[PDB]
Amino acid sequence: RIGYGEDSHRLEEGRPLYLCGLLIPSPVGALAHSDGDAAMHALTDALLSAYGLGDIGLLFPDTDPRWRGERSEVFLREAMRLVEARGAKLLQASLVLTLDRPKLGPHRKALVDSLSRLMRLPQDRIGLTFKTSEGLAPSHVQARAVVLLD
Amino acid sequence: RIGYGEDSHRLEEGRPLYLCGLLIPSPVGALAHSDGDAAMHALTDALLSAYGLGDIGLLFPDTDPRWRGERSEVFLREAMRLVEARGAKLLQASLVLTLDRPKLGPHRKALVDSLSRLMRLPQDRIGLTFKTSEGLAPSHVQARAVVLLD
Amino acid sequence: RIGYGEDSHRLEEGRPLYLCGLLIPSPVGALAHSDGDAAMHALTDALLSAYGLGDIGLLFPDTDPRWRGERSEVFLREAMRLVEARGAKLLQASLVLTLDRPKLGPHRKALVDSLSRLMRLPQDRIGLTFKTSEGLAPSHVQARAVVLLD
Numbered sequence: 301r302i303g304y305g306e307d308s309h310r311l312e313e314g315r316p317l318y319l320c321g322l323l324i325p326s327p328v329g330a331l332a333h334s335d336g337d338a339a340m341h342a343l344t345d346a347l348l349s350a351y352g353l354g355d356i357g358l359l360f361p362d363t364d365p366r367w368r369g370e371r372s373e374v375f376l377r378e379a380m381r382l383v384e385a386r387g388a389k390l391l392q393a394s395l396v397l398t399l400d401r402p403k404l405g406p407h408r409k410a411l412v413d414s415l416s417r418l419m420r421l422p423q424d425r426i427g428l429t430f431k432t433s434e435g436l437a438p439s440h441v442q443a444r445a446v447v448l449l450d
Numbered sequence: 451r452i453g454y455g456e457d458s459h460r461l462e463e464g465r466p467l468y469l470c471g472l473l474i475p476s477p478v479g480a481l482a483h484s485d486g487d488a489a490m491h492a493l494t495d496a497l498l499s500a501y502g503l504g505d506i507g508l509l510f511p512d513t514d515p516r517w518r519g520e521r522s523e524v525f526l527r528e529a530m531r532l533v534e535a536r537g538a539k540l541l542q543a544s545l546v547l548t549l550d551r552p553k554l555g556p557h558r559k560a561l562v563d564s565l566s567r568l569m570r571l572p573q574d575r576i577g578l579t580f581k582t583s584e585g586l587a588p589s590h591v592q593a594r595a596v597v598l599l600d
Numbered sequence: 601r602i603g604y605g606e607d608s609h610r611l612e613e614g615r616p617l618y619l620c621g622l623l624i625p626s627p628v629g630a631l632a633h634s635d636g637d638a639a640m641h642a643l644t645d646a647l648l649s650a651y652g653l654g655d656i657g658l659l660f661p662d663t664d665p666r667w668r669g670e671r672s673e674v675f676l677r678e679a680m681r682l683v684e685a686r687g688a689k690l691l692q693a694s695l696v697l698t699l700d701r702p703k704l705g706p707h708r709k710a711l712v713d714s715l716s717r718l719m720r721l722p723q724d725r726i727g728l729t730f731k732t733s734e735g736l737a738p739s740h741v742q743a744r745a746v747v748l749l750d
């Protein structure tokens with residue numbers, strides 16, 4: 301099975317930036333009702349999508365207390381619980397983060413380490429790449445992810 | 451086999467919105483020579499791509515009488531005919547629709563039912579997720595699709 | 601294994617346009633320190649991503665004299681060397697190029713022929729599709745690519 305997911309958030313100077321489950325030193329951060337971690341949302345949607353389960357807005361509406369104020373790893377782990385319950389064995393996650401600043405290369409090892417631990421995948425099965433927007437979206441972070449299961 | 455496809459259309463107020471084969475009640479809709487069904491087009495391109503057959507512009511030009519003014523499901527069905535003639539067995543489709551409004555959640559079941567009927571896939575093999583553009587693309591609909599075959 | 605990669609480049613009038621390894625006659629071309637071949641870059645990042653090896657800015661930075669000023673096919677061939685040494689067999693590449701002008705349809709045969717020759721894949725395993733940005737990104741070329749291996 302395969303699943304494809306996307307996320308994006310506007311970025312504001314002076315707000316914390318969460319990506320891949322980590323808080324990143326940065327002059328900008330997501331301006332969103334949640335932690336705005338585009339990487340974990342895209343991955344969560346891709347996982348849900350691989351089983352036709354819906355999307356993060358459907359399964360994690362802030363309307364439910366279980367979801368209100370929570371770090372995005374809560375949503376990812378719930379999506380893994382759901383697909384695992386359906387027989388899935390996650391094999392790979394490959395995703396692209398688009399953002400102009402900050403540079404994520406200095407944080408590559410920690411970002412991949414975090415995804416590896418969160419999704420319980422070997423490091424060679426975490427495919428993380430970074431790009432700028434070349435001016436197309438200078439005030440947003442964007443993430444697009446594919447997952448492979450079985 | 452895998453295939454990857456994308457489509458996008460300018461939205462304009464007061465035009466009909468078509469997604470996944472259905473009319474969706476909406477304040478806005480595609481500004482196009484097509485019905486502008488971004489989901490249908492992205493899936494068609496994904497299917498063609500999986501066999502290297504070209505893209506919707508090549509295969510379904512409106513300079514072609516069989517395809518001019520036709521609904522986009524006609525093109526999806528012809529793309530399925532072509533890949534099935536080459537021995538394909540579609541397994542799964544996962545796609546993301548990006549649009550600010552209207553909300554697609556209230557139409558989720560009908561949209562997934564439509565793709566399941568049209569591609570003859572079980573509901574758990576239709577992975578449909580929705581997102582807004584968080585202000586990045588307020589006047590467009592975008593779709594990106596992955597298909598898996600054999 | 602699967603990998604997903606993206607690239608984009610600003611377009612400017614009177615610069616040469618490189619796509620899939622080829623010069624494309626065009627009013628506009630990449631503004632870049634590289635040849636700005638978005639197709640090559642997205643495919644390279646997708647291959648690297650499939651083994652968790654990093655991205656083109658990590659492996660092929662222009663701070664490294666070995667890679668500065670090289671054509672983008674050089675990087676793609678080295679990515680192919682790296683995954684092959686890890687046991688990979690590339691099976692398929694599917695990618696989408698987004699750009700308003702020039703029209704790529706007249707170049708379709710040559711582009712596909714080039715990717716087939718470069719990746720050593722049969723034409724039915726090169727899935728190339730083209731789209732405009734519909735006004736969303738009129739001064740950029742964008743590429744998004746999925747690869748499948750083993």
Ligand SMILES: Nc1ccn([C@@H]2O[C@H](COP(=O)(O)O)[C@@H](O)[C@H]2O)c(=O)n1
Nearest residue numbers: 356357358549552553554555580581582
């Ligand atoms: N056009 C849209 C856009 C988003 N949505 C739901 O809204 C949610 C939140 O989307 P954002 O994260 O883009 O705000 C989604 O996860 C999707 O459930 C929708 O139902 N219709």
Ligand SMILES: Nc1ccn([C@@H]2O[C@H](COP(=O)(O)O)[C@@H](O)[C@H]2O)c(=O)n1
Nearest residue numbers: 506507508699702703704705730731732
């Ligand atoms: N630069 C481009 C962009 C699109 N095209 C062809 O133009 C078609 C229509 O694209 P739009 O749907 O973006 O208008 C495609 O499906 C592709 O055949 C092209 O040949 N060169």
Ligand SMILES: Nc1ccn([C@@H]2O[C@H](COP(=O)(O)O)[C@@H](O)[C@H]2O)c(=O)n1
Nearest residue numbers: 399402403404405430431432656657658
């Ligand atoms: N936010 C970002 C954006 C890009 N990068 C690195 O910068 C490189 C070049 O990115 P551009 O091609 O978008 O300029 C990448 O291939 C990635 O290594 C980064 O480390 N952090």
Ligand SMILES: [Mg+2]
Nearest residue numbers: 307308341581
């Ligand atoms: Mg979102």
Ligand SMILES: [Mg+2]
Nearest residue numbers: 307336338341
């Ligand atoms: Mg989000």
Ligand SMILES: [Mg+2]
Nearest residue numbers: 457458491731
């Ligand atoms: Mg189109």
Ligand SMILES: [Mg+2]
Nearest residue numbers: 457486488491
């Ligand atoms: Mg279209």
Ligand SMILES: [Mg+2]
Nearest residue numbers: 431607608641
């Ligand atoms: Mg780049």
Ligand SMILES: [Mg+2]
Nearest residue numbers: 607636638641
């Ligand atoms: Mg590039």
